[PDB]
C-alpha cells in the first residue's frame, strides 16, 4: 500500500505540473490547448481508477 | 479595442504563469526543473 | 488591400479569441458533471 | 463524527470547484487593473497550495 501511496503522491505532483503547463499553453498558444486538457483528465481518471479499486 | 484587450490579457497571463512558476519552485523545489522546461515548452 | 488585410486579420484574431473563450466555457460546463 | 473517506471526497470536490472558479476568473478577467488582478490571483494560488 506504500507503493499506491507514493504513486498517488507523484500523480498529484504531476497533475499540478501538467495543470501549470496547460495554463501556460492557454497563455501563449491556446489554439491547441485541448491537446493537453484531456491528457490531464486521463491522470484524473487514473486517480479515479485507483480510488475505485480502493472501494472493496 | 480588441487589440488592446489581447495585449492586456497576454500581459496578465504572462504575469500569472510567471508568479505560478515562481511559487511552484518555492514550495516545490523538486519540481523546479520541469517547470523551467515548461517555460521552454511554452516560450 | 493593406488596411483591409490588417482589418480582416485582426477580426479573425478577435473571434478566434471569442471562440476559444466559448469553448473553455463549454468544456467546463461539460466536465462539471465528471467533477 | 464524519468519516475520513467522506472528508477526502469533499476535499477533492472543493479542489475541483476551486480550480473551476480560478480558471473562470482568469477567463473573464484577462485584459481589471493589473495590480488588483495579480493580488486576487496570488490569493487564489495560496488557496490552491493550501487545498493541496
Swiss-Prot record, chain A:
Belongs to the Mediator complex subunit 7 family. This is Mediator of RNA polymerase II transcription subunit 7. Its main location: nucleus. Component of the Mediator complex, a coactivator involved in the regulated transcription of nearly all RNA polymerase II-dependent genes. Mediator functions as a bridge to convey information from gene-specific regulatory proteins to the basal RNA polymerase II transcription machinery. The Mediator complex, having a compact conformation in its free form, is recruited to promoters by direct interactions with regulatory proteins and serves for the assembly of a functional preinitiation complex with RNA polymerase II and the general transcription factors. GO terms for cellular component: core mediator complex; mediator complex; nucleus. One of its GO terms (molecular function) is transcription coactivator activity. It is found in: Nucleus. It comes from Saccharomyces cerevisiae (strain ATCC 204508 / S288c). Present with 7598 molecules/cell in log phase SD medium. GO terms for biological process: negative regulation of transcription by RNA polymerase II; positive regulation of transcription by RNA polymerase II; positive regulation of transcription elongation by RNA polymerase II; positive regulation of transcription initiation by RNA polymerase II; regulation of transcription by RNA polymerase II; RNA polymerase II preinitiation complex assembly.
From Swiss-Prot, chain B:
Disulfide bonds: none annotated. Keywords: Activator, Nucleus, Transcription, Transcription regulation. GO terms for cellular component: core mediator complex; mediator complex; nucleus. One of its GO terms (molecular function) is transcription coregulator activity. It is found in: Nucleus. GO terms for biological process: negative regulation of transcription by RNA polymerase II; positive regulation of transcription by RNA polymerase II; positive regulation of transcription elongation by RNA polymerase II; positive regulation of transcription initiation by RNA polymerase II; RNA polymerase II preinitiation complex assembly. The keyword Transcription regulation applies. Present with 1472 molecules/cell in log phase SD medium. Component of the Mediator complex, a coactivator involved in the regulated transcription of nearly all RNA polymerase II-dependent genes. Mediator functions as a bridge to convey information from gene-specific regulatory proteins to the basal RNA polymerase II transcription machinery. The Mediator complex, having a compact conformation in its free form, is recruited to promoters by direct interactions with regulatory proteins and serves for the assembly of a functional preinitiation complex with RNA polymerase II and the general transcription factors. Belongs to the Mediator complex subunit 10 family. This is Mediator of RNA polymerase II transcription subunit 10. The chain holds residues 106 to 148 of 157 of the full protein.
Curated annotation (Swiss-Prot), chain C:
This is Mediator of RNA polymerase II transcription subunit 14. Component of the Mediator complex, a coactivator involved in the regulated transcription of nearly all RNA polymerase II-dependent genes. Mediator functions as a bridge to convey information from gene-specific regulatory proteins to the basal RNA polymerase II transcription machinery. The Mediator complex, having a compact conformation in its free form, is recruited to promoters by direct interactions with regulatory proteins and serves for the assembly of a functional preinitiation complex with RNA polymerase II and the general transcription factors. The chain holds residues 160 to 194 of 1082 of the full protein. Present with 319 molecules/cell in log phase SD medium. It comes from Saccharomyces cerevisiae (strain ATCC 204508 / S288c). It is found in: Nucleus. Belongs to the Mediator complex subunit 14 family. It comes from the Eukaryota.
UniProtKB/Swiss-Prot annotation, chain D:
Component of the Mediator complex, which is composed of at least 21 subunits that form three structurally distinct submodules. The Mediator head module contains MED6, MED8, MED11, SRB4/MED17, SRB5/MED18, ROX3/MED19, SRB2/MED20 and SRB6/MED22, the middle module contains MED1, MED4, NUT1/MED5, MED7, CSE2/MED9, NUT2/MED10, SRB7/MED21 and SOH1/MED31, and the tail module contains MED2, PGD1/MED3, RGR1/MED14, GAL11/MED15 and SIN4/MED16. The head and the middle modules interact directly with RNA polymerase II, whereas the elongated tail module interacts with gene-specific regulatory proteins. It comes from Saccharomyces cerevisiae (strain ATCC 204508 / S288c). The chain holds residues 1 to 70 of 140 of the full protein. The lineage of its organism: Eukaryota, Fungi, Dikarya, Ascomycota, Saccharomycotina. The gene is SRB7. It comes from the Eukaryota. It is found in: Nucleus. Belongs to the Mediator complex subunit 21 family. Disulfide bonds: none annotated. Present with 1391 molecules/cell in log phase SD medium. Signal peptide: none annotated. This is Mediator of RNA polymerase II transcription subunit 21.
Amino acid at each position: 500500500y506504500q507503493y499506491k501511496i507514493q504513486e498517488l503522491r507523484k500523480l498529484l505532483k504531476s497533475l499540478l505540473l501538467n495543470y501549470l503547463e496547460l495554463i501556460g499553453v492557454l497563455s501563449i498558444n491556446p489554439d491547441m490547448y485541448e491537446r493537453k486538457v484531456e491528457n490531464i483528465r486521463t491522470i484524473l481518471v487514473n486517480i479515479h481508477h485507483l480510488l475505485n479499486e480502493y472501494r472493496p | 479595442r480588441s487589440n488592446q484587450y489581447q495585449r492586456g490579457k497576454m500581459h496578465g497571463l504572462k504575469q500569472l504563469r510567471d508568479s505560478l512558476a515562481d511559487k511552484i519552485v518555492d514550495e516545490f523545489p523538486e519540481l523546479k526543473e520541469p517547470v523551467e522546461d515548461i517555460i521552454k515548452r511554452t516560450s | 488591400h493593406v488596411l483591409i488585410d490588417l482589418l480582416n486579420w485582426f477580426r479573425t484574431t478577435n473571434m478566434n479569441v471569442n471562440n476559444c473563450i466559448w469553448a473553455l466555457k463549454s468544456s467546463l460546463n461539460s466536465m462539471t458533471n465528471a467533477k | 463524527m464524519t468519516d475520513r473517506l467522506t472528508q477526502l471526497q469533499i476535499c477533492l470536490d472543493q479542489m475541483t470547484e476551486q480550480f473551476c472558479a480560478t480558471l473562470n476568473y482568469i477567463d473573464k478577467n484577462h485584459g481589471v487593473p493589473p495590480e488588483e488582478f495579480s493580488n486576487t490571483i496570488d490569493e487564489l494560488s495560496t488557496d490552491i497550495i493550501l487545498k493541496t
